Design a protein around this nucleic acid. Structure first.
Lengths: 450, 465, 465, 450
RNA sequence: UGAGGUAGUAGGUUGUAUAGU
DNA sequence: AAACTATACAACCTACTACCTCAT
RNA sequence: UGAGGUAGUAGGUUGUAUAGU
DNA sequence: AAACTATACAACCTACTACCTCAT
């Protein structure tokens, strides 16, 4: 007895149409045999092909593609199909398929010209329909339609190298936790040693005004050389609050609320880090809502630092990398570093417009991937770190902040497999879809590039 | 030391009750569940748009390829995938002469030209489906590039929004008319070229994505449901709360919140919220008064009762701003004593940027970062094993989610939102950042707040996307 | 010496560029002109209505015939004739219980019963248009007969119309939704009897007529054109002036005169006539005021310009009551010089019963008795020359047409009107006595005068049949 | 070979269930020679089928009806059918039908239970698709499908002709000629002898009251019996005019116009006609407009007048014929006659309700045809005719009007073919379209007529 | 689709113009 | 009728909440 | 689907109720 | 101012116009 449908085709150029036909035929009920779903690597192919063709094959399905008429395997399969067709004495054995309008009807081989090929060129639904009703009028035995077997085959062979595996993989953040925190706050009751017009940013060390008080980690002897009339101040009038109670959330007094406590803590950490990064002698930039810096060209040696990329030039434009910081204490006492990038024409000044900066940043973004961005982040963090284990902050004359230079790494239980490098160009193509779906007023600024 | 937990890929159903994971492959392999015969398409525009329309229509019939079948699957054909026939004949055509445009172009008021061109398209469509016998299910309106490059708000020689399709849909909204905008540069990029010598709207390799997107949009606005989601316990509602505020200055909005919900299938019942004179935007943190809150909840529960006859056992509130005690107490009394209500906040402005040590790959989609029972993370973007590529740009960014009030399991809402970010219909993509209850929220607010004369709006989805 | 000038029956076109006579023949032997995919099946009613609708459609995908084929030609089935698809599945069903209706039956307010029952139908079908994601073209509505006998205006326990069809069409007219009235007894002829046992709807021998009528109505609400008349000279438009007395108007001297035009198909242009003073008690004859006639003819000219891009060569005015010179002068002032206008009136009540002596058939259809160049007869009722049967129950009654204003050949306008009696769509009949411009007259006037909430009606025609 | 589909059944029943298969198979591309389509009267009912069973019958189709399973010839045909089944060795020869579901599976003879029967109880679409499957499985020869042959047969099988036939056939109308017309119309200027309260239609002669004169036909000395003041009036004051001017239309005078005077002659004709036709002692009937008197039961001899069934009985009511007339003058000086028919339930009094009259007239109008109305009209007119060629009016004391009893016969050059009385039953079936198509608010009166 | 680009205020500061037992 | 003086909102001090382009 | 059946006022009768000169 | 006498329509007295239902 014979009940199997055999499909001869040209792999791998015709893998998609053959997968379509095989999966829909096995889902509609007909048992099919193809070299895609059965012939995998590591097995002998031709003996099984011959045995299945002349033992259990009921009908022959050959495709007539542009490369499906001059290849050797398809021609040999057609020859053995002709042999078994002559053995069975059935002109309804070979059913040719045409899937290309570029193919003329006089170019196919002599074993295809005698029978009318089923069209699969303009559409495929009625091609499946008129292949299906031609099977019934030839009275081939069939099984009831069950798509459960098609799902199993689809999950078996078509999801082998494209599914998650179980292996541990490590990942690193941009988060830098605060290893050491000061013990006490310093609230200073002056009430006449500060003028009403005084700006607190002019101080060499950070401080904030609080209703009659000055909050900092500094001391009363720190403000001598710029405020002369702080010499008469006595330190007893100042009040001090332990930071462990503030951090543990167990402190809530009428004089200052816990939310206000953590707000002053994070805000004063913020301008302390700003003043320290100012003390590193790094050039400034006027960002919209934050305050990010950028390293000067020609200062770092060899344009390298532990064999890493940080700064350079692509198209007469010195691209300068920079970071921005913002303290966070809700999940953990940690400092977050954000990534930014701005360009300079000469390396000394900036660009007179922001639209060119944004467009050129988006231009320059896709050339590299997240590995380079990781190198950039770690490079800037370890360059800023006067210390090799932490960044020496500058908040007082005797007490400092210790922020570690390494990020807190997070590792996962299971992750992906590692394919080749074609996916980076594929993601560049994905950026081309990002081009090809959305755009808005792209004329004037693009014309203003030359 | 704490680790990362994983949430499995949620499955979506297809024809004959079978589950897959890729919308393109899973909808090509099996097909839609509820099948229709097909649709008749009618176009309004110039004759060049008509011949462009035909060229593309025929091309969409013939199968098209890509450079690989891993990321963007091929297009086997409209009938081969959906089971509906599309042809070149029986296309209703309404033309527009260039003399009207050339005479009306020279007005200084750009908004007046926008308004009268929009009303010209509106009443041509209204007459066309109110005069002709032949039915049209989807109206493919095509627009030239002169009105797109010379009639912009910043061209150099307030409740109605200045953009075209916004007020077009809002004006066609009250007559039950689905339509789809087709930019002329989208489907005629062969000859649409700039002065430099390269098509900026390039599709030399990504024709399949255009075919997939247009076919999916046309079939969703046909009437048939393409796909649904896998597991729904009895009595759960995903009430996605819209927070789209409109930008009218002197007209007092003070609130423009709406709400969407998914109950048993992919269909959504989006009811128009209040105009909301409460808490003028100087205090715009959206603490809702009890009467409008119970109105919104009453409409949600009444639509649930109308479509499913059973009381909701659990109600999930998808939002993006914090909730307080008075609004929670207002929400609790109208809902019955047996049911439970939980609100979640999804935000994008919160930064967290994980990096990967060696190699050249991003963090893969599915991992979750849990800090507390209250707050957690979920990596909706990133690498995906199925496509062997990523979906973000250079680095994925997670979404900060946190339950406001109510007892629940954090991993449950994690897999629930990961299932909710799969039901996109306008774009035939694998996944997107915000959930579809929030992705549709911006558009539904953007059209429903752009028309003040609509008091009984449609509760469907076709007349918007 | 008087003779009867006979006019041959004109032939209507069909598919593949060929002509036939008896439409159902051409239809069940050749096919419709333009092909539709299928029709959206949708029903609203109780469970008994759903099951009888399922059983009836299960009867009608099967060909059903009559007692003799000399009466009605052959009907080989829905699919083989129409080429469009129809099933027992994908039936959208909106449930309506019987407790609220029975609770509301007890009051003496029959008009409030009519209002809230038709509102219960309307809000359900509107929500099905809006809440449901899928789209419905044709709606089917059934009604229990208990409501039909126990709640009539003459039962015992102001500008609108008491008919359900009238107010249903008026209420759904501004929503662009076609719906067909379906009696419960007409679709359930097998079990609906009285206490004696004879079927009141005795359809045991006339099932072919029922199948033909239901199929033709369901196809016409889809949008397909079944036939087109044979000889159209280019540049003609037949204006059939509706005449309907509205006694419910606030002015006893007030009525409405809408417009109906057929120019190249069976599609009419339903333009509502205003509510103004045309009735008079001393001449008894509706004369159009100058501005009203100018508005009517100018909007007819704009409709012809919109649907044919060129000026009409001739315009024929069909009516029922005669004219006077002031409206004719007003018409000619908004009529181009190279165009001809003819005023034609059609009366029925004038009797001329020409009997006959021997032979088993009455006076055949096609004869005419002329009196002069402007006042004549036309025998449109009687023996059919191809059916070999007679349509008139007894002696055919002729029609006394008069050519009051205008100059045209009497035989040409006689031919044109008897050819215009070949465009009936609600009933699958061979032809009718009065022209279809006056057959649709009562339906259009009754629907437009069924509700005061109509501002401007659609130009389309399916929302009336 | 074998290509023919043939059907058998009881001629009267299943007139549809055989024309169904015959027309469907002839329109779907198969040669069909069946009983109703091709075996008309005068053709042998057995020899043609006896030749076809051994010459060209592919499949035999038999309906196991209520009256079709007792005929001898069809069972003998079945015997020869199983003889060719055991000769040609094909068991798929007979395909039975089942339309009458009242018959059970233990009622058919033993010759059909040996073979499977295709079900026709749910729907027949699956029946025709299984018939097509049975055709294509056994490889039956056929013709490509075409519906032109079916239509050109259908309009020439027993539909005799659809083309005009030129032969003369006479006609008749309802207009009645007038032989004798009144010679002079007169205006009587009494001016004080006519009381205002005295109605002018109470006179024995028609006289109508206009502003200075009476439009009447009676002489100046014809109103003595009604008005004694008439004798005092001198007859030379009255104006007296001839009617040749009204019938020929040259009457142009300022005091009385023309159209109003034609209205005057038709009003006088109606009044004098009412007086005369009530002078015949004929019982009346009440309608809105006219007075249609009807012949009393027992007045006519043996219910017959000149071989014409005039009145009678329809299962509970006596029907009596009558007419209503209104003159016309613009086309010709004729007197238009309307056909009326009045019902009574004992021959004494009328039916109180009007809806009973209308419904009963409608239900009795379906039985006979218009020839009976010719006979009834002619009989009523001849009974109303005093002499042989006219009807004698009563208008005045000396002047009378005569109207022709015979109608105005017309002539025709174009008439069609006349079948037997089957067309009367066909028209009766056509009369059920009124019930079939439209009905509105009829149940309340439906429950009252019994 | 995503990383910048913009005005505005979530909510506890201190300067306007009073008026209370 | 009048002594002290905070009153009673309310304009404003550093950054939390959707907005609206930008071109990949 | 055609011969009616209902109110009622077409085109011309004579009472309501006043003002022209 | 007063010697005229018909006004000036126009609601109804018998008879021609579009509703409507009415069923086998």
């Amino acid at each position: 007895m014979r009940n199997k449908i055999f499909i001869s085709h040209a792999t791998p150029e015709d893998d998609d149409f053959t997968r379509w036909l095989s999966l829909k035929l096995i889902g509609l009920g007909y048992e099919v045999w193809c070299d895609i779903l059965f012939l995998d690597k590591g097995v002998d192919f031709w003996s099984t092909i011959e045995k299945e063709i002349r033992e259990n094959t009921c009908k022959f399905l050959i495709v007539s593609s542009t490369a499906g008429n001059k290849r050797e395997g398809v021609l040999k399969e057609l020859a053995v199909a002709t042999k078994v067709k002559k053995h069975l004495q059935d002109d309804m054995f070979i059913i040719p398929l045409a899937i290309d309008e570029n193919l003329s009807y006089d170019d196919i081989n002599i074993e295809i010209v005698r029978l009318n090929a089923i069209d699969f060129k303009k559409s495929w639904a009625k091609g499946l329909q008129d292949l299906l009703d031609a099977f019934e009028k030839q009275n081939v035995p069939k099984k009831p339609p069950d798509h459960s077997k098609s799902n199993l085959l689809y999950q078996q062979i078509f999801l082998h190298d494209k599914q998650a595996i179980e292996k541990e993989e490590t990942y690193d953040s941009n988060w830098f936790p605060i290893i050491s925190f000061p013990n006490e706050l310093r609230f200073h009751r002056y009430d006449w040693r500060l003028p009403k017009q005084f700006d607190v940013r002019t101080l060499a060390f950070p401080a904030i005004r609080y209703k009659e008080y000055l909050c900092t980690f500094a001391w009363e002897y720190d403000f001598i050389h710029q405020l002369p009339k702080t010499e008469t101040y006595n330190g007893q009038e100042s009040i001090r609050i332990s930071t462990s109670d503030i951090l543990s959330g167990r402190y809530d007094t009428d004089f200052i609320r816990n939310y206000e406590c953590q707000r002053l803590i994070v805000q004063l950490i913020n301008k302390a880090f700003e003043l320290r990064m100012k003390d590193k002698n790094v050039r400034e930039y006027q960002m919209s809502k934050t305050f990010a810096y950028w390293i000067e060209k020609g200062k770092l040696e060899k344009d390298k630092f532990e064999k890493i990329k940080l700064v350079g030039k692509q198209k007469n434009k010195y691209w300068h990398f920079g970071i921005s910081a913002a303290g966070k204490l809700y999940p953990s006492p940690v400092l977050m570093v954000s990534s930014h990038i701005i360009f300079t024409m000469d390396g000394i000044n900036l660009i007179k417009s922001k639209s060119i900066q944004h467009s050129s940043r988006r231009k320059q973004g896709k050339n590299w991937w997240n590995d380079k961005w990781r190198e950039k982040l770690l490079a800037f963090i370890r360059f800023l770190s006067d210390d090799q284990n932490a960044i020496y902050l500058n908040v007082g004359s005797e007490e400092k902040i210790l922020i570690s230079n390494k990020p807190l790494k997070f590792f996962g239980k299971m992750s992906y497999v590692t394919p080749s490098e074609v996916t980076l160009e594929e993601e560049s193509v994905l950026a081309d879809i990002n081009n090809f779906e959305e755009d808005t007023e792209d004329l004037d600024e693009l014309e203003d590039i030359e | 030391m704490k680790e990362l937990i994983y949430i499995e890929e949620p499955s979506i159903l297809f024809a004959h009750g079978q589950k897959c994971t890729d919308p393109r492959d899973g909808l090509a392999l099996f097909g839609p569940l509820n099948q229709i015969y097909g649709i008749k398409s009618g176009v309004v525009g110039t004759q060049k748009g008509l011949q462009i329309f035909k060229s593309y229509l025929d091309k969409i019939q013939k199968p098209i390829y890509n450079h690989n079948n891993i990321t963007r699957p091929m297009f086997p054909g409209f009938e081969a995938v959906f089971g509906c026939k599309w042809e070149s004949q029986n296309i209703v055509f309404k033309e527009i002469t260039d003399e009207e445009i050339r005479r009306y172009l020279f007005n200084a008021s750009t908004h007046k030209r926008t308004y009268d061109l929009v009303t010209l398209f509106n009443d041509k469509i209204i007459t066309a489906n109110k005069n002709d016998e032949e039915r049209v299910d989807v109206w493919f309106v095509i627009v030239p590039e002169e009105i797109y490059k010379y009639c912009r708000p910043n061209s150099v020689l307030y409740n109605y929004d200045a953009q075209f399709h916004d007020q077009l849909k809002a004006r066609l909204l009250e007559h039950t008319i689905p339509t789809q905008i087709l930019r002329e540069s989208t489907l005629a990029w062969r000859d649409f070229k700039n002065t430099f010598g390269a098509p900026i709207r390039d599709f030399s390799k990504i024709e399949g994505h255009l075919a997939w997107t247009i076919s999916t949009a046309a079939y969703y606005k046909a009437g048939g449901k393409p796909w649904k989601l896998g597991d729904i316990r009895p009595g759960v509602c995903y009430l996605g709360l819209v927070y789209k505020k409109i930008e009218k200055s002197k007209n007092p909005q003070n609130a423009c919140c709406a709400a969407q919900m998914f109950l048993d299938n992919g269909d959504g019942t989006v009811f128009k919220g209040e105009v909301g004179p409460w808490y003028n935007p100087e205090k715009g943190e959206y603490h809702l008064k009890p009467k409008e809150a119970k109105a919104l909840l009453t409409q949600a529960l009444e639509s649930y009762k109308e479509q499913n006859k059973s009381y909701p056992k659990e109600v999930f509130i998808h939002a993006r701003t914090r909730f307080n005690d008075e609004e929670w107490n207002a929400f609790n009394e109208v809902t019955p004593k047996n049911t439970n209500l939980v609100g979640v906040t999804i935000t994008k402005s919160k930064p967290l940027k994980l990096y990967k040590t060696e190699g050249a790959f991003p963090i893969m989609r599915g991992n979750a970062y849990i800090v507390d029972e209250k707050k957690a993370f979920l990596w909706t973007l990133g690498f995906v094993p199925k496509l062997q590529s990523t979906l973000s740009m250079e680095v994925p960014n997670p979404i900060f989610i946190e339950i406001n009030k109510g007892e629940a399991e954090i991993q449950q809402v994690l897999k629930d939102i990961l299932a909710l970010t799969k039901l996109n219909y306008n774009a035939c993509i694998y996944a997107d950042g915000e959930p579809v209850t929030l992705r549709f929220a911006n558009k539904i607010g953007e059209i429903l707040t752009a028309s003040t004369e609509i008091k009984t709006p449609p509760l469907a989805f076709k007349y918007y996307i």
